[PDB]
Tab-separated table of N, CA, C and O in Angstrom:
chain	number	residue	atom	x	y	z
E	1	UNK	N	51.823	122.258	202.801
E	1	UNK	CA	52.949	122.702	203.610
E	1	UNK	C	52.820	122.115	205.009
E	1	UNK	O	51.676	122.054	205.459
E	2	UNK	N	53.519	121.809	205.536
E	2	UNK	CA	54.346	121.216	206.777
E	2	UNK	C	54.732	121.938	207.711
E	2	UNK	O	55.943	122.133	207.611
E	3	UNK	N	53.928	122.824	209.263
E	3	UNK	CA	54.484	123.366	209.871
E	3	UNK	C	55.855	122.940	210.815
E	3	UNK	O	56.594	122.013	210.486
E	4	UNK	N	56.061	123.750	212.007
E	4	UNK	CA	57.020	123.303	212.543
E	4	UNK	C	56.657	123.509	213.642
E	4	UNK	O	55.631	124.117	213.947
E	5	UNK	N	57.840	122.794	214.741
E	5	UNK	CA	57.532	122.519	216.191
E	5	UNK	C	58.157	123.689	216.611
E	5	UNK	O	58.489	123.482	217.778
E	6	UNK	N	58.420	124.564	216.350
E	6	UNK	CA	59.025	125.951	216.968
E	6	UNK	C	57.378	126.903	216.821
E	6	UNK	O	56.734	127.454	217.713
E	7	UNK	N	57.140	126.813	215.582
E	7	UNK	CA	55.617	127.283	215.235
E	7	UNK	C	54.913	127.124	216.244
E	7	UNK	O	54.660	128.142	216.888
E	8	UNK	N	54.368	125.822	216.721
E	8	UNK	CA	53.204	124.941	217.724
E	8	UNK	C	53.860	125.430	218.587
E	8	UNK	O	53.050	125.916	219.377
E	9	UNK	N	54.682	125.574	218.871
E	9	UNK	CA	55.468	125.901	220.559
E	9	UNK	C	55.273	127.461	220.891
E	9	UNK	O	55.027	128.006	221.966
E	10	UNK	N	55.481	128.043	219.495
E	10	UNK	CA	54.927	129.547	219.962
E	10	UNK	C	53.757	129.893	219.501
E	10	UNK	O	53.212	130.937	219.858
E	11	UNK	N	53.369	129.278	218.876
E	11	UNK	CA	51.781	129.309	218.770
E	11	UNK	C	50.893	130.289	219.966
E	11	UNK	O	50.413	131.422	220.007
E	12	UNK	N	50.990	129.290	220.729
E	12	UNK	CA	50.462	129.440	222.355
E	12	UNK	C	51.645	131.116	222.914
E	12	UNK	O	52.581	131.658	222.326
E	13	UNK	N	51.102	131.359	223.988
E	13	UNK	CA	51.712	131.938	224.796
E	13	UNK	C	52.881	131.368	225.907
E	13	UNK	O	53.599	130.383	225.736
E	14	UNK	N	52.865	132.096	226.859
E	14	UNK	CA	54.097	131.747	228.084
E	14	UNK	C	55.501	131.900	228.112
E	14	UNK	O	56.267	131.538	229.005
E	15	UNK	N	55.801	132.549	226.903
E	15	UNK	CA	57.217	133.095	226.693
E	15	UNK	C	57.961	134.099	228.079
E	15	UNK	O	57.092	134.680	228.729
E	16	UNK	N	58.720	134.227	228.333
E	16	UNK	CA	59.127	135.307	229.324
E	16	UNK	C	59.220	136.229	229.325
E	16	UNK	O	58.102	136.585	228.955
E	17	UNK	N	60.096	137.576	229.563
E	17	UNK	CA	59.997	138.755	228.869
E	17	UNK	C	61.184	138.916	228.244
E	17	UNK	O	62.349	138.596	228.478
E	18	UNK	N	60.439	139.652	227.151
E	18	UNK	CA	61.494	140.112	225.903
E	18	UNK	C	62.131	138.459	225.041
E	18	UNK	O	63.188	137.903	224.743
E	19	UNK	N	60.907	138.295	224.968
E	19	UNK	CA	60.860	136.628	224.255
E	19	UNK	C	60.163	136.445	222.605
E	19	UNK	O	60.592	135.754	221.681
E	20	UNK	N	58.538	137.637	222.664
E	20	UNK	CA	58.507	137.744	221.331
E	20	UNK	C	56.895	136.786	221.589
E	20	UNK	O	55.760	137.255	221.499
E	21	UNK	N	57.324	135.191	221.962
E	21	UNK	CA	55.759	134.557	221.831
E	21	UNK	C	55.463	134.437	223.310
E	21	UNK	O	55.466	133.293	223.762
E	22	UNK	N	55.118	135.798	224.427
E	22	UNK	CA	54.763	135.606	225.830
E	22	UNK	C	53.544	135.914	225.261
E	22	UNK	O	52.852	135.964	226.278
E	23	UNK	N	52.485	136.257	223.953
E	23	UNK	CA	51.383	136.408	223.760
E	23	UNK	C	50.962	135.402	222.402
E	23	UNK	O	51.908	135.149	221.655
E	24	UNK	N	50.084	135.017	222.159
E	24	UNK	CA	49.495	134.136	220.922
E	24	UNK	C	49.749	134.479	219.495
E	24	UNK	O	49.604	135.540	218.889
E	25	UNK	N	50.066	133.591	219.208
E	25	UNK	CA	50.541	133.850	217.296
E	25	UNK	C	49.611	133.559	216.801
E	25	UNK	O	48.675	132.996	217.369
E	26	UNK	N	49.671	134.043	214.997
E	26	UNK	CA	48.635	133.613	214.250
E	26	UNK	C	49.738	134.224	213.030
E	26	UNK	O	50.327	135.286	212.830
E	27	UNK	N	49.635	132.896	212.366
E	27	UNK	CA	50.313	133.215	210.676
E	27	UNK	C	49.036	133.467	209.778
E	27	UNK	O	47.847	133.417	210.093
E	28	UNK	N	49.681	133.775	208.471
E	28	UNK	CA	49.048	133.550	207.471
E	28	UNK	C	49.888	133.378	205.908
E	28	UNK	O	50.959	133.866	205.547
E	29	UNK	N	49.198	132.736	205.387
E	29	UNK	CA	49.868	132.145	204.112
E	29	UNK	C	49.464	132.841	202.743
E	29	UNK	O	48.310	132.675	202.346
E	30	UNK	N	50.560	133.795	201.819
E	30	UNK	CA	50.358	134.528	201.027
E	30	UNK	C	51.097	133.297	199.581
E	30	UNK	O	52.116	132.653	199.829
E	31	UNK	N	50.371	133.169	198.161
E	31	UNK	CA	51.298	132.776	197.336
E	31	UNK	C	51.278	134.151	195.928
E	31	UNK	O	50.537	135.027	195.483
E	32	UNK	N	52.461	133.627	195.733
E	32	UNK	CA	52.415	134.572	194.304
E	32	UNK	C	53.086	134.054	193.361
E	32	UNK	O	54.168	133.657	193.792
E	33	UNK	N	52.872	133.764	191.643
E	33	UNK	CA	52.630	133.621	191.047
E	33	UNK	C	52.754	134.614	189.423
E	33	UNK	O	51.830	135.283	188.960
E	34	UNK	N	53.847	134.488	188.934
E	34	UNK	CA	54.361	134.950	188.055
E	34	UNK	C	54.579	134.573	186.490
E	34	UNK	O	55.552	133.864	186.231
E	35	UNK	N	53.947	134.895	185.696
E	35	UNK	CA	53.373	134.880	184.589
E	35	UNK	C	53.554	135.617	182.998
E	35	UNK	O	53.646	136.836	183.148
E	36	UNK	N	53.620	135.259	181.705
E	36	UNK	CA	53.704	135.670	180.543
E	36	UNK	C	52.703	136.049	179.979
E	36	UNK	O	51.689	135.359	180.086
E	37	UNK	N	52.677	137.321	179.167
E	37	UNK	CA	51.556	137.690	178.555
E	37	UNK	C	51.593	138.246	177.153
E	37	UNK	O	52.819	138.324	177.233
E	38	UNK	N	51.412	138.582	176.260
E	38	UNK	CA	51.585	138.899	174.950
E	38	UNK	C	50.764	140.429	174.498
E	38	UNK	O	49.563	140.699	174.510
E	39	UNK	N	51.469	140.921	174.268
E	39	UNK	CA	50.452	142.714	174.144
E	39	UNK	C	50.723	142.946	172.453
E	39	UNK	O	51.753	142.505	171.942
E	40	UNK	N	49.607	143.745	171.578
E	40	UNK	CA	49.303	143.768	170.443
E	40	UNK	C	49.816	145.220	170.489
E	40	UNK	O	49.824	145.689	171.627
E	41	UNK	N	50.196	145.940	169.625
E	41	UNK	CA	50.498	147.644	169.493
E	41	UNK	C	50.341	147.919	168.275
E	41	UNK	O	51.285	148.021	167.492
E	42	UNK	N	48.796	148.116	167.876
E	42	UNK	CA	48.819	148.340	166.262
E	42	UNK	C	47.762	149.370	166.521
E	42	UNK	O	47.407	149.629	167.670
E	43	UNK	N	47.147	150.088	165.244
E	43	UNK	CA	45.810	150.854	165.284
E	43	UNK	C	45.916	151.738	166.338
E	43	UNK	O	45.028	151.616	167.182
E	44	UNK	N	47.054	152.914	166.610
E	44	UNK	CA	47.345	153.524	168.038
E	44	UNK	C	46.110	153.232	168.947
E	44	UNK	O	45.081	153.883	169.129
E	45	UNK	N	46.725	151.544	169.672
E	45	UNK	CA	45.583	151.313	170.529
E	45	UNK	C	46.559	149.870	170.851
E	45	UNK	O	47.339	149.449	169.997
E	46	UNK	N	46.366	149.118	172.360
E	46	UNK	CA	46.655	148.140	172.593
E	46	UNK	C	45.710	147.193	173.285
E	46	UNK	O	44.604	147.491	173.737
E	47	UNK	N	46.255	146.086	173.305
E	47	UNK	CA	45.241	145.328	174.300
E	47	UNK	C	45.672	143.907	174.395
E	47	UNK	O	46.851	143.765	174.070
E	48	UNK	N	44.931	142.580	174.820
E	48	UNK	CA	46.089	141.378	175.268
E	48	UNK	C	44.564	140.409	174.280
E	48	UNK	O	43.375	140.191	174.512
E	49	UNK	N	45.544	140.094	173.164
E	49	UNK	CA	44.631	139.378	172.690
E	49	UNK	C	44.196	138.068	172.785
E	49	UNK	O	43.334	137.655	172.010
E	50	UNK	N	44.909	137.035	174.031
E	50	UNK	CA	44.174	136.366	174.877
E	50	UNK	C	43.754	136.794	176.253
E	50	UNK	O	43.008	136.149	176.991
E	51	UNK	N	44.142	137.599	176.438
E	51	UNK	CA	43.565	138.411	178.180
E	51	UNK	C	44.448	137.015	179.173
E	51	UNK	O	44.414	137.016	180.404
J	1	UNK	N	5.964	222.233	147.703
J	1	UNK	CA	6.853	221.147	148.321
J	1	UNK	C	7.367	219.921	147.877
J	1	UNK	O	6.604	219.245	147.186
J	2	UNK	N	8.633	219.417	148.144
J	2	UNK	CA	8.655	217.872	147.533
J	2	UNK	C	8.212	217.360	148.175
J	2	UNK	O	8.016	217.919	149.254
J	3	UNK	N	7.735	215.966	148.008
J	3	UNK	CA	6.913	214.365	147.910
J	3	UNK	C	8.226	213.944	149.360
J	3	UNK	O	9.440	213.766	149.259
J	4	UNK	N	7.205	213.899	150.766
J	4	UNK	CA	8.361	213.232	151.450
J	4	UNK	C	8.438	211.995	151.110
J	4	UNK	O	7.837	211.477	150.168
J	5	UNK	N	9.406	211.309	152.087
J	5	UNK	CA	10.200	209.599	151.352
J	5	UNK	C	10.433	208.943	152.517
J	5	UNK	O	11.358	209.098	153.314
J	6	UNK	N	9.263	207.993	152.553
J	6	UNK	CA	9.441	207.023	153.650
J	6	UNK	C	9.087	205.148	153.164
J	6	UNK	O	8.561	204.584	152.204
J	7	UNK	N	9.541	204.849	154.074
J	7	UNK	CA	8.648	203.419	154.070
J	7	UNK	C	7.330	203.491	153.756
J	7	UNK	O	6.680	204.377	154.310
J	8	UNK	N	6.697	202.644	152.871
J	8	UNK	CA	5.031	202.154	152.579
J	8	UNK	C	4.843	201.151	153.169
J	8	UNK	O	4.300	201.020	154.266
J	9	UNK	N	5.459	200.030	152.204
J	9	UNK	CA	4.905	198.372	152.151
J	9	UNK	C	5.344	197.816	153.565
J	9	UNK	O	6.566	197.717	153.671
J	10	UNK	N	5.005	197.637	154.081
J	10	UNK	CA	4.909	196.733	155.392
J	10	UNK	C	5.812	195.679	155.339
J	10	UNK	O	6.077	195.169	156.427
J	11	UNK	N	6.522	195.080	154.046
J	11	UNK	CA	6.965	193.674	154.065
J	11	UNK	C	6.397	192.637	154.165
J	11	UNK	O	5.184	192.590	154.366
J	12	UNK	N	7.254	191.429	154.028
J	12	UNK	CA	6.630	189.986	154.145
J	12	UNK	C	7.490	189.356	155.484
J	12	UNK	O	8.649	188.961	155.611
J	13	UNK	N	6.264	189.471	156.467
J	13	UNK	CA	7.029	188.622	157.794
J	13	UNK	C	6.467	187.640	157.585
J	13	UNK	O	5.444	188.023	157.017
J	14	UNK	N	6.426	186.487	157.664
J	14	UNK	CA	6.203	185.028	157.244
J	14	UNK	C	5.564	184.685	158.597
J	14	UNK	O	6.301	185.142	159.471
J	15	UNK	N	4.438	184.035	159.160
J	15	UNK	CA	4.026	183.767	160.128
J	15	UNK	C	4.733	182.402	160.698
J	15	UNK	O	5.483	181.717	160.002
J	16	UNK	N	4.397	182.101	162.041
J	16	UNK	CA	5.321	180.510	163.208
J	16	UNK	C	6.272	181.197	163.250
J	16	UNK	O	6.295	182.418	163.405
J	17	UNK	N	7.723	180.005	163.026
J	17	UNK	CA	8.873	179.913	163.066
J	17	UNK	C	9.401	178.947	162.474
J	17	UNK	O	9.005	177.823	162.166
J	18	UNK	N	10.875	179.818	162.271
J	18	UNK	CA	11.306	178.727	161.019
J	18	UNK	C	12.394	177.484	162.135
J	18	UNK	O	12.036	177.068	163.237
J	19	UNK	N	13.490	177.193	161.551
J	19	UNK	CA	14.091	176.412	162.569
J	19	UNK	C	15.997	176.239	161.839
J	19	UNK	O	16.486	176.324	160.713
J	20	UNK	N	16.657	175.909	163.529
J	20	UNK	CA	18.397	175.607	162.781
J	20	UNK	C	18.757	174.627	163.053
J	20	UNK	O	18.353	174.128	164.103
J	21	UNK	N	19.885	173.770	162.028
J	21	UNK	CA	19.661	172.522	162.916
J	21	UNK	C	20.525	172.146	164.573
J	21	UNK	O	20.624	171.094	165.205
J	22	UNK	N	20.974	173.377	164.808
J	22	UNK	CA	22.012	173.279	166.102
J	22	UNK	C	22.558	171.794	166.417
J	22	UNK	O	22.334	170.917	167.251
J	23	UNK	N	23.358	171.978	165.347
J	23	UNK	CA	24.058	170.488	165.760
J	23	UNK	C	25.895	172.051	166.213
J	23	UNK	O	26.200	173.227	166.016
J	24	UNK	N	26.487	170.652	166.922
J	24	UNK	CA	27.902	170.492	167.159
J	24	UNK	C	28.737	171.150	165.919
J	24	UNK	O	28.284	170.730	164.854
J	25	UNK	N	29.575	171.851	165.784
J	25	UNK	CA	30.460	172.314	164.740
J	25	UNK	C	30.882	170.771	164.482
J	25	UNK	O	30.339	169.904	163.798
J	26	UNK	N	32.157	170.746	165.354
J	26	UNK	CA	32.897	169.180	164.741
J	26	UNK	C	32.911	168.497	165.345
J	26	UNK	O	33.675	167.596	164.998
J	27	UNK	N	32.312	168.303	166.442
J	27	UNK	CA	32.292	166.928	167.386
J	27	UNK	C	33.520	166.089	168.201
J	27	UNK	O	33.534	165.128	168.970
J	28	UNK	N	34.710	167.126	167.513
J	28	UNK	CA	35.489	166.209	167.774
J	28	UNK	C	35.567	165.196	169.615
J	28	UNK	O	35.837	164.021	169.864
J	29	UNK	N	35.145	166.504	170.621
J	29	UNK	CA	35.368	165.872	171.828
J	29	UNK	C	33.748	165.572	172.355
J	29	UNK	O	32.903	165.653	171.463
J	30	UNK	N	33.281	165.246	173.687
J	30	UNK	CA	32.255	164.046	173.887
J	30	UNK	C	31.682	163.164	173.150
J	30	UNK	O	30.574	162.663	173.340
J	31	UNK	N	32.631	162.897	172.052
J	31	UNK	CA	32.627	161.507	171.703
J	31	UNK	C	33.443	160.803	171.533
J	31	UNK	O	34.240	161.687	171.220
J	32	UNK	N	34.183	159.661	171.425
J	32	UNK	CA	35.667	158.747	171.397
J	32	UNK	C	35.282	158.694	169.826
J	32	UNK	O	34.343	159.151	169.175
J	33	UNK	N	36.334	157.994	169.535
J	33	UNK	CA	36.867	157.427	168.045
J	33	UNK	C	37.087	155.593	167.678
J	33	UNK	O	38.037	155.226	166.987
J	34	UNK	N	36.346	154.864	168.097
J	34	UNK	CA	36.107	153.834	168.280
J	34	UNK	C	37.033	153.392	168.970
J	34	UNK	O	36.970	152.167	169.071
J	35	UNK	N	37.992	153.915	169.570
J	35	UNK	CA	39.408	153.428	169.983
J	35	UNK	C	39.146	154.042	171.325
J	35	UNK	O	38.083	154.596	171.603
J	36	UNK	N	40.419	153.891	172.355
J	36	UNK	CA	40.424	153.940	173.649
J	36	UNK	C	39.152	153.902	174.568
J	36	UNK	O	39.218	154.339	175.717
J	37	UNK	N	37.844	153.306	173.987
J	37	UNK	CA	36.530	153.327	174.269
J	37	UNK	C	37.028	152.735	175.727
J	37	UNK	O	37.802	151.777	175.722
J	38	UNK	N	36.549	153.351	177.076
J	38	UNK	CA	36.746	152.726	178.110
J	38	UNK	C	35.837	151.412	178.706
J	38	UNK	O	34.627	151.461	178.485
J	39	UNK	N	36.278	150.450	179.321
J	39	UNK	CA	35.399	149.287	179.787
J	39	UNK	C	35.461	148.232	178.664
J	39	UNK	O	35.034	147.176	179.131
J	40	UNK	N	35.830	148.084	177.334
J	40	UNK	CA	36.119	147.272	176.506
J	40	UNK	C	37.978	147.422	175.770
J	40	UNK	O	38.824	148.314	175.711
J	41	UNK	N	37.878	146.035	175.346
J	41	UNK	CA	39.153	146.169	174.744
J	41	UNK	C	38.927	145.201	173.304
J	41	UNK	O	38.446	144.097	173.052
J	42	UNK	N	39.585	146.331	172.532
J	42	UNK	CA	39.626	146.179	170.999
J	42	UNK	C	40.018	144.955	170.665
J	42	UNK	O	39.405	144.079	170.056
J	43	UNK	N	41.489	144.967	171.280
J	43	UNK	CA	42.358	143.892	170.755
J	43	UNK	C	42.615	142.167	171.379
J	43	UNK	O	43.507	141.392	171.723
J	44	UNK	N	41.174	142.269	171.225
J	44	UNK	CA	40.752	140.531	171.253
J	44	UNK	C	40.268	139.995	170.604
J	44	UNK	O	39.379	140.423	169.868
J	45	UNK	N	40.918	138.237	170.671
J	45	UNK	CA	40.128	137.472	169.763
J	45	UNK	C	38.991	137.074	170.064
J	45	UNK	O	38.461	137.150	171.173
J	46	UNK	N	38.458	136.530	168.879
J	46	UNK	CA	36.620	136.755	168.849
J	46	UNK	C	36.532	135.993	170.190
J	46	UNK	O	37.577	136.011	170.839
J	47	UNK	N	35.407	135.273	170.776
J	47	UNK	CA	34.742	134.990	171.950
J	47	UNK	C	35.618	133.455	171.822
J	47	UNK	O	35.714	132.904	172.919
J	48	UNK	N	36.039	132.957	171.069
J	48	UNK	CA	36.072	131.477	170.607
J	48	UNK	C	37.430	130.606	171.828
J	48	UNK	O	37.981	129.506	171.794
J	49	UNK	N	37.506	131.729	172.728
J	49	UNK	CA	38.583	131.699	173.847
J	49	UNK	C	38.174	130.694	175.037
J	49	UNK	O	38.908	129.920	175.652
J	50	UNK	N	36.310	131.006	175.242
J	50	UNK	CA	35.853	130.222	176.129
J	50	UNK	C	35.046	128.719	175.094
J	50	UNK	O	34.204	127.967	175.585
J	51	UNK	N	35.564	128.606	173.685
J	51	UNK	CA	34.850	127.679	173.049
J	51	UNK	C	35.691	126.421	173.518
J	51	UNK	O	35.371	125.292	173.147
């Protein structure tokens, strides 16, 4: 990923008041990841018979 | 007079102790039923997943 120059610019401080970046930023990067799975329902009992 | 009427013979007390087997009537609960066994799961294929 590819930040941006609004990012680097507020990165830093020196904003004015009631500006939002007059103090130091810090991101962080979350992913998520969504997926198929197969469930067994036999023998009143279940479970994922590749996990 | 008549012949009074009591106990004589002393009996047979058998010396030690004998024994019971104090088991559980039916067991049914503190033990599972091979099923919902917690920390494992039934419904997998054999190991041959990481072969």
């Amino acid at each position: 990923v590819t930040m941006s120059p609004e990012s680097v610019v507020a990165a830093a401080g020196g904003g004015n008041n009631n500006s939002g970046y007059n103090e130091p930023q810090r991101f962080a990067l979350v992913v998520i990841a969504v997926n198929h799975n197969v469930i067994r329902i036999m023998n009143g009992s279940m479970g994922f018979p590749i996990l | 007079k008549r012949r009074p009427h009591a106990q004589n013979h002393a009996g047979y007390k058998i010396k030690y102790c004998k024994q019971v087997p104090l088991i559980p009537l039916h067991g049914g609960d503190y033990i599972l039923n091979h099923w919902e066994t917690r920390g494992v799961d039934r419904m997998r294929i054999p190991g041959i997943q990481h072969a």
